[PDB]
Amino acid sequence: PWHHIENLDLFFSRVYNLHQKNGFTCMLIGEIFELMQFLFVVAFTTFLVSCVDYDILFANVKVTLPDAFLPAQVCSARIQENGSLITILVIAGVFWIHRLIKFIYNICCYWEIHSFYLHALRIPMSALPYCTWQEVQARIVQTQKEHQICIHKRELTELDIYHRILRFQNYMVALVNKSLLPLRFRLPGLGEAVFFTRGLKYNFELILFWGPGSLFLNEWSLKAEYKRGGQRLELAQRLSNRILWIGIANFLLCPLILIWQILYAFFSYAEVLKREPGALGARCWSLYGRCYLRHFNELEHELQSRLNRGYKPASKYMNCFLSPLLTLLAKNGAFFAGSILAVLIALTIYDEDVLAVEHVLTTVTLLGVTVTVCRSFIPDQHMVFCPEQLLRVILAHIHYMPDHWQGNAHRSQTRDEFAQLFQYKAVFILEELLSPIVTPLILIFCLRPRALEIIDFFRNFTVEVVGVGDTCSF
Amino acid sequence: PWHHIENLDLFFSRVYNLHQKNGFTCMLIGEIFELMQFLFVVAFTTFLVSCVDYDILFANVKVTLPDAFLPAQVCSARIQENGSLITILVIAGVFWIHRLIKFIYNICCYWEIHSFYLHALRIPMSALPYCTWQEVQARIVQTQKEHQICIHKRELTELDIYHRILRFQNYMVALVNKSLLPLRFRLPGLGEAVFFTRGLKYNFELILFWGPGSLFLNEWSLKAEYKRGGQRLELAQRLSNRILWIGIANFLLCPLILIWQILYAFFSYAEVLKREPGALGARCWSLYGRCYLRHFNELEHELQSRLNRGYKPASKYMNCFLSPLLTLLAKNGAFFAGSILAVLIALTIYDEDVLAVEHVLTTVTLLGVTVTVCRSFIPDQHMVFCPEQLLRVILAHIHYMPDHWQGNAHRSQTRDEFAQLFQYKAVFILEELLSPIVTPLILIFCLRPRALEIIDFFRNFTVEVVGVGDTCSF
Amino acid sequence: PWHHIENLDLFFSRVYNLHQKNGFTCMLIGEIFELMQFLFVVAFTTFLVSCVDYDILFANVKVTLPDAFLPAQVCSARIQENGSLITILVIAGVFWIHRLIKFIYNICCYWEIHSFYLHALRIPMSALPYCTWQEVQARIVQTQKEHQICIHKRELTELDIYHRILRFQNYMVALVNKSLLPLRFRLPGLGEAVFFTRGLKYNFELILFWGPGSLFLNEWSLKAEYKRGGQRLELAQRLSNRILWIGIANFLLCPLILIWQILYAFFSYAEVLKREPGALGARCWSLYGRCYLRHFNELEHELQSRLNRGYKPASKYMNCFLSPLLTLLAKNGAFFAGSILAVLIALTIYDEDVLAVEHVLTTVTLLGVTVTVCRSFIPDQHMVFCPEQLLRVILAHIHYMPDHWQGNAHRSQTRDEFAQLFQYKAVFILEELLSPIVTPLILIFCLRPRALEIIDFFRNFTVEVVGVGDTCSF
């Protein structure tokens, strides 16, 4: 049954994702909840926009919650009469319909992959969350005589699976580390800024890999016309028109994507700020650090493991960088604020009628917040300031660092250059919000003039591995 | 003075316990508070049952606490007229009287031991909490010519003290690790369940060691009739009647012991749930792990040290076992719950008259609890899932593990088999509550048919160390 | 320009302090805020004493904060009419005027030092917080031919800078470790007490080093009359009169210094008790541990580093010392208190009208505090009591320990002797409050009779390093 496939690339990617999804039911259940998140976001916002009145809620006998909710009939009439609301719902509906159809097709294709694990590999569906990818890899390669998926190539190789699954991610890796993508900016008042988000990466792969107008012929071979240097300018002009058109589509989609990014950050992170706002000060590896620190032919879990082992030294390293002025001001401000708040607390503690004076509680509240915030920049008085050993621990995991980091490991410039590989989480959120606005501008003015250079790139750094196809240079 | 003892076994146990009690006053003070805990439990429950009225408390001028308390005369009349309350108090009184008489006798016997530390060993009572058992051991054995406690045996030996103190605990160890005690069960809806509590261990030692009808003649020699195989069936029948009778006593005592176990768990753990309920999710070594992981000839502190060194790796190991479905549901539920709660919090934060709507606070409260509970099953996104090194650290301390744990260290079955050696604290509490109900059933139907096998056991695995007596096989 | 200095001692101290102050602006900004702290303390207390009325605050329409504040005119009239308040303000004004004049002079002298870093060393003012003292040390010593600050001595040496900056701190070190200063006391009800504060150290340096009547001629040479033993008694009598006079000045200043110490502890620590009172239970290295554990020729940062590396093992070591009686009482008290509080919480949880009974909340509140306090003396049940390895880790950093600590590392006496080198923070605060009262008594009765011994000391342990001057013996 596993002979007429013709799409071994997509097949191996699906074989890997089911292992990364911890079986079949979790993938199905995970996909359903993904679809449900969008629908819930849309429905709750729509319900909040139309049904609830907010008049009898602010009161302008105890009132129940169901009173503020309008009955179904009047809520439907206000939705279908907003005009400026139904036009967003229509677009948010067609994307989900496309997604749902794609999902149904993927289920019917992942069920076929399920049989291949069960039958060809003899690995039950209850042992997946306990089977490393290495175990799955040995049974696929050693039994390649039975299922005879690839008879065309003389044999199958471990390097082949890595190349087949990751034919386009290697291309993505080569573009960012050769500065062939517009991800460096100079800003007035900020200085150097690296703006690399998921929209640009999604757009790069859509411009270069996916679509009927991309550089790749079917799935695993870029069009032969891109292997001849006789029409570099003509191909560049054609690519420039393509790049220009994709940017126009992004500019058209700007308002919709902005609503989606805003809604996602709010529904996902606007509650952690209330309960534990220090979690958004905790740092995480940025998307550039995932493409700058990524080896060639390295799967998602092999890289995620390295970013996990180097997560605790990185928090310490970024936390040993203080500021003589910030530390001075924090020390002094905490003293002054706490010295006033202590008197206030004593007058409050003795007789509590002071709590009825107008601006006593707010002053105490803001000062408690002020003391706690200011006392958070004051380090532990007996810490071992060792910001030189911290880089050793980090480099032992992520494996990549600019050459001007080893000696001067403690300057304020090295921290500001490391903070771009290891960014705040709050900063991460903020540039996910700005991605749908800046991404089109980046593609039209910065990437379009490079449309020639890319054409040279794809022409000079693409080799042809026999039996595999057109792959990216290491 | 230390020549006419005739009970060197009990003497050495008392010598050890005073060191484990950190001197003499602490033992006296500890015993008094132990007696006082029972009396307080009984008295407070009795006072709550009879004196307080709960009528003028629920209000059916500010009211004081002493108003709800009835005067002594009317409270005494209601106690001595309850009938169904005085019959429990009588039993709770006679046990304490027995305990108090035993305590007074033990004090007069521990005072004699106090003189032996002070005079024979020349160790002051202010240096006990700072003297290891090794220091006490060297001065006892090296000065065995002066106090001449044991002249019968040619000399005294360190192995002898371990054997003399622990003649019955070794027997307890051999029964659990040879599955000679009924502590394995199959339950519909739960599967495998190991139910081993203090009542069974107390009952085992009462059936086998203590009492005038046990297997041991005086204190340190089982009756010679149990060394002849000519009457195995007859001895088994006699033992079966004994086992049957002990079970009947337990069945009779079931309601009383149940009240004691319920009261003890409530008074000891029902407040930690309110303040810090995560402490009852913290795991602890179960009573079977104390008998399965216990070496032979190992005192209480030597084992407690090993269970201490292996406590932190064990919490990590049991905490690295997740569930693809539980983690998926938690992630998704937290998002949905937090997404609703964030909107609620914003409407609450803007104008607080929303706080007067009926079901807004309860929804917020349950959802905050829901988010916090659900967000507690979501691991740290950058943790080093290394559940294989954790078993190495644990095995280096407790020294005992089933053979099918080394290879498959990460299956869901190994965790469910390790959770029986290292059980939850909440689970520990729950099976202490169920011990007085299930313990009689275990003894009558499961241990009684084994009454023959035990007779064989005690006949084949009991050696006679010269000068020491009848000991258990290692 | 760096030739006519004549005060190389003060110059090198200033060169070091600017590095310890992380540049020039931070020193200027730090000094200004230091001056501002005193002024704010005085002004706020004065404003609180005179302006606010506390009559319309305790209420004896919602009332604003500005109503309680008296207008400027009536507040000025009450200040300048208090009599017993203006006499304190005058003294608190003249000290600050002296301080401000000294500060202005130091700025004009540190600006000259700023040019020496910028020009002679070619080290910009933006690289100071990132330059170790070693980098500053190499450029000073290797370029000693250009600025020719010291041509008198043949060359400059690293030992010379250490000696020049720290000519008086070495003297302070030799007096405390030879028990030549009155810092040991026997108290009824407390026993041994080591009372060494900043006032005594400040007074010691004022009696011995600073002033026109001290032992040192100009700055770096004690008067030659103190190098001849022919007038030991006469010099001792003169020194005794000096010591007596300094003590009289301290006794006169007792009330003022007491107000300053009280105010400083309150404004600095009286708020941490409210928010996080466990931070004042955290220990810190006492002032005697800074003079007992200090090497010879060791700068402030080299010692602070050692006190930082040995801070975490020291907290563990002092936290592994329990008390059999304290642990027993805590266990039992927590059980009893929690057993009552659990019943109270259940009655409170079922129906909340119980919250209106008078003494229910206070009982719950005090018992919650009681449980939390008592449950703070109860250690973790599975901790590795290893108070012997902890001393190894500590001694590896502070380098100094009494000889009767190595063997008996766990007695209650070693802890009570280590607690004097590593004292509580709350204890530290308390003896800073008592320093202005006890310091004069210590100098008059204990140090005055020693006035002879000191004269012998300064005569026998002062060597003359050529080119450097009169230094202290190592």
Side-chain angles (χ1 to χ4, degrees):
Chain A
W2 318 292
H3 192 189
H4 48 57
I5 299 169
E6 319 166 309
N7 211 2
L8 277 183
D9 282 314
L10 191 65
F11 174 78
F12 282 130
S13 297
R14 269 165 185 157
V15 168
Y16 178 66
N17 192 2
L18 187 87
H19 159 52
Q20 283 306 106
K21 289 301 183 294
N22 285 320
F24 176 68
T25 183
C26 315
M27 203 209 58
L28 172 61
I29 287 171
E31 295 292 328
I32 290 168
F33 278 105
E34 210 173 323
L35 301 198
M36 274 165 50
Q37 273 191 6
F38 186 88
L39 188 53
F40 163 85
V41 160
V42 174
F44 195 38
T45 305
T46 289
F47 163 85
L48 283 184
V49 161
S50 303
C51 273
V52 194
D53 55 349
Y54 306 118
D55 262 296
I56 65 171
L57 197 72
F58 292 156
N60 70 337
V61 62
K62 195 183 289 185
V63 18
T64 49
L65 272 174
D67 306 321
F69 301 159
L70 286 177
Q73 299 354 354
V74 59
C75 196
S76 88
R78 197 158 319 282
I79 281 177
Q80 285 158 101
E81 204 145 312
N82 216 306
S84 315
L85 180 79
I86 202 72
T87 180
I88 295 174
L89 286 198
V90 159
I91 306 176
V94 305
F95 174 68
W96 188 77
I97 280 295
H98 153 70
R99 197 148 283 280
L100 172 66
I101 278 179
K102 193 176 71 193
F103 157 73
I104 284 186
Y105 158 72
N106 270 344
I107 296 302
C108 290
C109 275
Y110 267 111
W111 188 245
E112 194 161 63
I113 316 291
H114 160 95
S115 303
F116 171 79
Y117 261 103
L118 264 187
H119 301 335
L121 275 70
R122 282 173 284 275
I123 296 183
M125 219 46 57
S126 80
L128 264 191
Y130 311 107
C131 274
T132 62
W133 173 250
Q134 320 299 327
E135 311 186 10
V136 186
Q137 192 168 327
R139 201 83 66 104
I140 286 184
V141 60
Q142 85 180 4
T143 78
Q144 71 103 20
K145 325 290 198 305
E146 289 85 85
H147 47 83
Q148 51 182 344
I149 56 171
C150 167
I151 301 197
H152 297 88
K153 178 64 165 320
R154 212 68 70 88
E155 191 180 2
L156 213 65
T157 317
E158 318 96 310
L159 178 84
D160 283 6
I161 305 175
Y162 268 77
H163 272 104
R164 292 281 186 180
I165 302 177
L166 301 169
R167 188 191 297 278
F168 294 139
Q169 273 302 134
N170 295 343
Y171 272 123
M172 276 306 300
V173 166
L175 280 168
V176 165
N177 295 349
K178 292 194 73 173
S179 291
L180 270 177
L181 300 176
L183 55 88
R184 318 288 282 265
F185 300 113
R186 295 289 298 166
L187 290 184
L190 211 53
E192 264 291 321
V194 180
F195 192 89
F196 198 35
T197 55
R198 287 171 185 171
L200 278 175
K201 197 196 175 198
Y202 179 75
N203 278 294
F204 293 162
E205 296 179 329
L206 162 67
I207 284 164
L208 286 152
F209 305 135
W210 316 323
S214 45
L215 273 73
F216 284 73
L217 173 57
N218 48 7
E219 182 70 359
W220 43 276
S221 312
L222 73 162
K223 306 171 176 172
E225 55 175 339
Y226 289 92
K227 293 169 189 157
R228 306 190 297 267
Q231 39 183 351
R232 295 187 328 118
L233 323 178
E234 185 260 349
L235 293 167
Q237 191 52 43
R238 190 190 307 159
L239 187 66
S240 159
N241 311 336
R242 184 159 215 265
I243 296 172
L244 171 79
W245 291 128
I246 300 280
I248 290 298
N250 289 316
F251 179 73
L252 292 186
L253 292 181
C254 173
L256 297 187
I257 310 174
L258 187 51
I259 287 176
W260 159 255
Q261 290 294 342
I262 295 279
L263 291 183
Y264 190 78
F266 178 80
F267 282 148
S268 197
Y269 296 117
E271 185 57 300
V272 181
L273 288 181
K274 180 70 182 294
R275 181 183 37 83
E276 183 215 350
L280 296 186
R283 301 172 160 278
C284 68
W285 297 100
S286 44
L287 190 41
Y288 164 69
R290 295 184 136 272
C291 274
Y292 174 81
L293 311 165
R294 180 158 185 157
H295 289 311
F296 279 99
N297 276 4
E298 192 184 26
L299 304 168
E300 186 76 26
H301 70 280
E302 299 182 19
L303 166 65
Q304 185 65 30
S305 304
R306 301 201 281 102
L307 298 196
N308 284 3
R309 287 164 139 77
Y311 178 78
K312 284 169 74 172
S315 315
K316 292 181 204 155
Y317 174 78
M318 295 310 280
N319 276 357
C320 278
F321 252 92
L322 47 92
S323 274
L325 186 52
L326 196 70
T327 312
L328 276 174
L329 296 180
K331 279 181 185 296
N332 295 122
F335 173 78
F336 293 130
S339 61
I340 302 182
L341 197 46
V343 168
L344 265 188
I345 277 176
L347 284 182
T348 312
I349 278 177
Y350 174 62
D351 182 273
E352 79 173 40
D353 303 304
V354 189
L355 280 169
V357 191
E358 294 194 355
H359 301 285
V360 166
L361 278 171
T362 303
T363 305
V364 166
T365 290
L366 292 178
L367 287 178
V369 175
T370 291
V371 171
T372 299
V373 163
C374 287
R375 286 200 190 277
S376 87
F377 300 156
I378 301 179
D380 49 346
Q381 320 300 38
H382 311 265
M383 63 184 316
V384 286
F385 288 107
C386 63
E388 189 48 88
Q389 313 144 217
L390 287 175
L391 287 180
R392 297 199 205 108
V393 185
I394 293 161
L395 159 72
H397 299 148
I398 73 179
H399 291 190
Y400 290 102
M401 268 186 192
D403 312 284
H404 57 290
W405 276 17
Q406 283 315 105
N408 44 313
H410 53 280
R411 300 307 144 80
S412 140
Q413 182 207 52
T414 298
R415 192 270 310 275
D416 298 341
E417 278 180 3
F418 195 93
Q420 294 163 355
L421 271 54
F422 207 58
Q423 75 184 2
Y424 278 134
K425 184 89 176 175
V427 169
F428 166 83
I429 303 153
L430 174 58
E431 84 183 24
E432 272 299 355
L433 259 61
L434 309 184
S435 163
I437 297 174
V438 182
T439 302
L441 305 191
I442 291 184
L443 287 167
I444 295 288
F445 301 104
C446 296
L447 177 60
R448 206 153 63 95
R450 283 167 170 274
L452 177 54
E453 315 179 0
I454 288 186
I455 291 298
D456 288 342
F457 166 73
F458 278 91
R459 201 185 83 249
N460 292 339
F461 288 85
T462 285
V463 311
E464 284 205 50
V465 187
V466 295
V468 174
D470 293 78
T471 80
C472 174
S473 307
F474 286 167
Chain B
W2 318 292
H3 192 189
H4 48 57
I5 299 169
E6 319 166 309
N7 211 2
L8 277 183
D9 282 314
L10 191 65
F11 174 78
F12 282 130
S13 296
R14 269 165 185 157
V15 168
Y16 178 66
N17 192 2
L18 187 87
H19 159 52
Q20 283 306 106
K21 289 301 183 294
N22 285 320
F24 176 68
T25 183
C26 315
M27 203 209 58
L28 172 61
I29 287 171
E31 295 293 328
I32 290 168
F33 278 105
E34 210 172 323
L35 301 198
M36 274 165 50
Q37 273 191 6
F38 186 89
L39 188 53
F40 163 85
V41 160
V42 174
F44 195 38
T45 305
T46 289
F47 163 85
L48 283 184
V49 161
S50 303
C51 273
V52 194
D53 55 349
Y54 306 118
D55 262 296
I56 65 171
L57 197 72
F58 292 156
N60 70 338
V61 62
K62 195 183 289 185
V63 18
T64 49
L65 272 174
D67 306 321
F69 302 159
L70 286 177
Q73 299 354 354
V74 59
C75 196
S76 88
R78 197 158 319 282
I79 281 177
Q80 285 158 101
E81 204 145 313
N82 216 306
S84 315
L85 180 78
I86 202 72
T87 180
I88 295 174
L89 286 198
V90 159
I91 306 177
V94 305
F95 174 68
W96 188 77
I97 280 295
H98 153 70
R99 197 148 283 280
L100 172 66
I101 278 179
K102 193 176 71 193
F103 157 73
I104 284 186
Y105 158 73
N106 270 344
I107 296 302
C108 290
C109 275
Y110 267 111
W111 188 245
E112 194 161 63
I113 316 291
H114 160 95
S115 303
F116 171 79
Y117 261 103
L118 264 187
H119 301 335
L121 275 70
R122 282 173 284 275
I123 296 183
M125 219 46 57
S126 80
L128 264 191
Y130 311 107
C131 274
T132 62
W133 173 250
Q134 320 299 327
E135 311 186 10
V136 186
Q137 192 168 327
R139 201 83 66 104
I140 286 184
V141 59
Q142 85 180 4
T143 78
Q144 71 103 20
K145 325 290 198 305
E146 289 85 85
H147 47 83
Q148 51 182 344
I149 56 171
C150 167
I151 301 197
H152 297 88
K153 178 64 165 320
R154 212 68 70 88
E155 191 180 2
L156 213 65
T157 317
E158 318 96 310
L159 178 84
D160 283 6
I161 305 175
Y162 268 77
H163 272 104
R164 292 281 186 180
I165 302 177
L166 301 169
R167 188 191 297 278
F168 294 139
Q169 273 302 134
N170 295 343
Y171 272 123
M172 276 306 300
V173 167
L175 280 168
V176 165
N177 295 349
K178 292 194 73 173
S179 291
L180 270 177
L181 300 176
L183 55 88
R184 318 288 282 265
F185 300 113
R186 295 289 298 166
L187 289 184
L190 211 54
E192 264 291 321
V194 180
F195 192 89
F196 198 35
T197 55
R198 287 171 185 171
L200 278 175
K201 197 196 175 198
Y202 179 75
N203 277 294
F204 293 162
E205 296 179 329
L206 162 67
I207 284 164
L208 286 152
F209 305 135
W210 316 323
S214 45
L215 273 74
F216 284 73
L217 173 57
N218 48 7
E219 182 70 359
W220 43 276
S221 312
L222 73 162
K223 306 171 176 172
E225 55 175 339
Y226 289 92
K227 293 169 189 157
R228 306 190 297 267
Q231 39 183 351
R232 295 187 328 118
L233 323 178
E234 185 260 349
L235 293 167
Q237 191 52 43
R238 190 190 307 159
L239 187 66
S240 159
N241 312 336
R242 184 159 215 265
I243 296 172
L244 171 79
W245 291 128
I246 300 280
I248 290 298
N250 289 316
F251 179 73
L252 292 186
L253 292 181
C254 173
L256 297 187
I257 310 174
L258 187 51
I259 287 176
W260 159 255
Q261 290 294 342
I262 295 279
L263 291 183
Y264 190 78
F266 178 80
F267 282 148
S268 197
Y269 296 117
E271 185 57 300
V272 181
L273 288 181
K274 180 70 182 294
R275 181 183 37 83
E276 183 215 350
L280 296 186
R283 301 172 160 278
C284 68
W285 297 100
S286 44
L287 190 41
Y288 164 69
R290 295 184 136 272
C291 274
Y292 174 81
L293 311 165
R294 180 158 185 157
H295 289 311
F296 279 99
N297 276 4
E298 192 184 26
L299 304 168
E300 186 76 27
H301 70 280
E302 299 182 19
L303 166 65
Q304 185 65 30
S305 304
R306 301 200 281 102
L307 298 196
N308 284 3
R309 287 164 139 77
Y311 178 78
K312 284 169 74 172
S315 315
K316 292 181 204 155
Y317 174 79
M318 295 310 280
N319 276 357
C320 278
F321 252 92
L322 47 92
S323 274
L325 186 52
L326 196 70
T327 312
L328 276 174
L329 296 180
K331 279 181 185 296
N332 295 122
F335 173 78
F336 293 130
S339 61
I340 302 182
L341 197 46
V343 168
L344 265 188
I345 277 176
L347 284 182
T348 312
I349 278 177
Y350 174 62
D351 183 273
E352 79 173 40
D353 303 304
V354 189
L355 280 169
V357 191
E358 294 194 356
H359 301 285
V360 166
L361 278 170
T362 303
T363 305
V364 167
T365 290
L366 292 178
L367 287 178
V369 175
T370 291
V371 171
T372 299
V373 163
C374 287
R375 286 200 190 277
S376 87
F377 300 156
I378 301 179
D380 49 346
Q381 320 300 38
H382 311 264
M383 63 184 316
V384 286
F385 288 107
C386 63
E388 189 48 88
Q389 313 144 217
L390 287 175
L391 287 180
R392 297 199 205 108
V393 185
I394 293 161
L395 159 72
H397 299 148
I398 73 179
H399 291 190
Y400 290 102
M401 268 186 192
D403 312 285
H404 57 290
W405 276 17
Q406 283 315 105
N408 44 313
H410 53 280
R411 300 307 144 80
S412 140
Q413 182 207 52
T414 298
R415 192 270 310 275
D416 298 341
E417 278 180 3
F418 195 93
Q420 294 163 355
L421 271 54
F422 207 59
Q423 75 184 2
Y424 278 133
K425 184 89 176 175
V427 169
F428 166 83
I429 303 153
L430 174 58
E431 84 183 24
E432 272 299 355
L433 259 61
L434 309 184
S435 163
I437 297 174
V438 182
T439 302
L441 305 191
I442 291 184
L443 287 167
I444 295 288
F445 301 104
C446 296
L447 177 60
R448 206 153 63 95
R450 283 167 170 274
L452 177 54
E453 315 179 0
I454 288 186
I455 291 298
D456 288 342
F457 166 73
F458 278 91
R459 201 185 83 250
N460 292 339
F461 288 85
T462 285
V463 311
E464 284 205 51
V465 187
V466 295
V468 174
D470 293 78
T471 80
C472 174
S473 307
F474 286 167
Chain C
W2 318 292
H3 192 189
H4 48 57
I5 298 169
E6 319 166 309
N7 211 2
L8 277 183
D9 282 314
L10 191 65
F11 174 78
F12 282 130
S13 296
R14 269 165 185 157
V15 168
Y16 178 66
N17 192 2
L18 187 87
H19 159 52
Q20 284 306 106
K21 289 302 183 294
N22 285 320
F24 176 68
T25 183
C26 315
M27 203 209 58
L28 172 61
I29 286 171
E31 295 293 328
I32 290 168
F33 278 105
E34 210 172 323
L35 301 198
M36 274 165 50
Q37 273 191 6
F38 186 88
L39 188 53
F40 163 85
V41 160
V42 174
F44 195 38
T45 304
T46 289
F47 163 85
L48 283 184
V49 161
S50 303
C51 273
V52 194
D53 55 349
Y54 306 118
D55 262 296
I56 65 171
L57 197 72
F58 292 156
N60 70 337
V61 62
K62 195 183 289 185
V63 18
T64 49
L65 272 174
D67 306 321
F69 302 159
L70 286 177
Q73 299 354 354
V74 59
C75 196
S76 88
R78 197 158 319 282
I79 281 177
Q80 285 158 101
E81 204 145 313
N82 216 306
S84 315
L85 180 79
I86 202 72
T87 180
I88 295 174
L89 286 198
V90 159
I91 306 177
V94 305
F95 174 68
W96 188 77
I97 280 295
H98 153 70
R99 197 147 283 280
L100 172 66
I101 278 179
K102 193 176 71 193
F103 157 73
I104 284 186
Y105 158 73
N106 270 344
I107 296 302
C108 290
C109 275
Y110 267 111
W111 188 245
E112 194 161 63
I113 316 291
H114 160 95
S115 303
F116 171 79
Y117 261 103
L118 264 187
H119 301 335
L121 275 70
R122 282 173 284 275
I123 296 183
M125 219 46 57
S126 80
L128 264 191
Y130 311 107
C131 274
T132 62
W133 173 250
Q134 320 299 327
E135 311 186 10
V136 186
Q137 192 168 327
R139 201 83 66 104
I140 286 184
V141 59
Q142 85 180 4
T143 78
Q144 71 103 20
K145 326 290 198 305
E146 289 85 85
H147 47 83
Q148 51 182 344
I149 56 171
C150 167
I151 301 197
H152 297 88
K153 179 64 165 320
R154 212 68 70 88
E155 191 180 2
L156 213 65
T157 317
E158 318 96 310
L159 178 84
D160 283 6
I161 305 175
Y162 268 77
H163 272 104
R164 292 281 186 180
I165 303 177
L166 301 169
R167 188 191 297 278
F168 294 139
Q169 273 302 134
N170 295 343
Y171 272 122
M172 276 306 300
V173 166
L175 280 168
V176 165
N177 295 349
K178 292 194 73 173
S179 291
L180 271 177
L181 300 176
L183 55 88
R184 318 288 282 265
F185 300 113
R186 295 289 298 166
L187 290 184
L190 211 53
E192 264 291 321
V194 180
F195 192 89
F196 198 35
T197 55
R198 287 171 185 171
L200 278 175
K201 197 195 175 198
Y202 179 75
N203 278 294
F204 293 162
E205 296 179 329
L206 162 67
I207 284 164
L208 286 152
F209 305 135
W210 316 323
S214 45
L215 273 73
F216 284 73
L217 173 57
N218 48 7
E219 182 70 359
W220 43 276
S221 312
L222 73 162
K223 306 171 176 172
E225 55 175 339
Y226 289 92
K227 292 169 189 157
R228 306 190 297 267
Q231 39 183 351
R232 295 187 328 118
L233 323 178
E234 185 260 349
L235 293 167
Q237 191 52 43
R238 190 190 307 160
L239 187 66
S240 159
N241 311 336
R242 184 159 215 265
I243 296 172
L244 171 79
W245 291 128
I246 300 280
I248 290 298
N250 289 316
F251 179 73
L252 292 186
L253 292 181
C254 173
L256 297 187
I257 310 174
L258 187 51
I259 287 176
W260 159 255
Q261 290 294 342
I262 295 279
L263 291 183
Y264 190 78
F266 178 80
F267 282 148
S268 197
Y269 296 117
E271 185 57 300
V272 181
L273 288 181
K274 180 70 182 294
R275 181 183 37 83
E276 183 215 350
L280 296 186
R283 301 172 160 278
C284 68
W285 297 100
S286 44
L287 190 41
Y288 164 69
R290 295 184 136 272
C291 274
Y292 174 81
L293 311 165
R294 180 158 185 157
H295 289 311
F296 279 99
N297 276 4
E298 192 184 26
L299 304 168
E300 186 76 26
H301 70 280
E302 299 182 19
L303 166 65
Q304 185 65 30
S305 304
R306 301 200 281 102
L307 298 196
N308 284 3
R309 287 164 139 77
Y311 178 78
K312 284 169 74 172
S315 315
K316 292 181 204 155
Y317 174 78
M318 295 310 280
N319 276 357
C320 278
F321 253 92
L322 47 92
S323 274
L325 186 52
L326 196 70
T327 312
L328 276 174
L329 296 180
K331 279 181 184 296
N332 295 122
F335 173 78
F336 293 130
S339 61
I340 302 182
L341 197 46
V343 168
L344 265 188
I345 277 176
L347 284 182
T348 312
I349 278 177
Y350 174 62
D351 183 273
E352 79 173 40
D353 303 304
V354 189
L355 280 169
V357 191
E358 294 194 355
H359 301 285
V360 166
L361 278 171
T362 303
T363 305
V364 166
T365 290
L366 292 178
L367 287 178
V369 175
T370 291
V371 171
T372 299
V373 163
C374 287
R375 286 200 190 277
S376 87
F377 300 156
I378 301 179
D380 49 346
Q381 320 300 38
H382 311 265
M383 63 184 316
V384 286
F385 288 107
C386 63
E388 189 48 88
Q389 313 144 217
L390 287 175
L391 287 180
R392 297 199 205 108
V393 185
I394 293 161
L395 159 72
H397 299 148
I398 73 179
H399 292 190
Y400 290 102
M401 268 186 192
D403 312 284
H404 57 290
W405 276 17
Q406 283 315 105
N408 44 313
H410 53 280
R411 300 307 144 80
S412 140
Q413 182 207 52
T414 298
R415 192 270 310 275
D416 298 341
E417 278 180 3
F418 195 93
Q420 294 163 355
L421 271 54
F422 207 58
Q423 75 184 1
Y424 278 133
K425 184 89 176 175
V427 169
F428 166 83
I429 303 153
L430 174 58
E431 84 183 24
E432 272 299 355
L433 259 61
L434 309 185
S435 163
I437 297 174
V438 182
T439 302
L441 305 191
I442 291 184
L443 288 167
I444 295 288
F445 301 104
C446 296
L447 177 60
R448 206 153 63 95
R450 283 167 170 274
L452 177 54
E453 315 179 0
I454 288 186
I455 291 298
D456 288 342
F457 166 73
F458 278 91
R459 201 185 83 249
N460 292 339
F461 288 85
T462 285
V463 311
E464 284 205 50
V465 187
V466 295
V468 174
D470 293 78
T471 80
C472 174
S473 307
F474 286 167

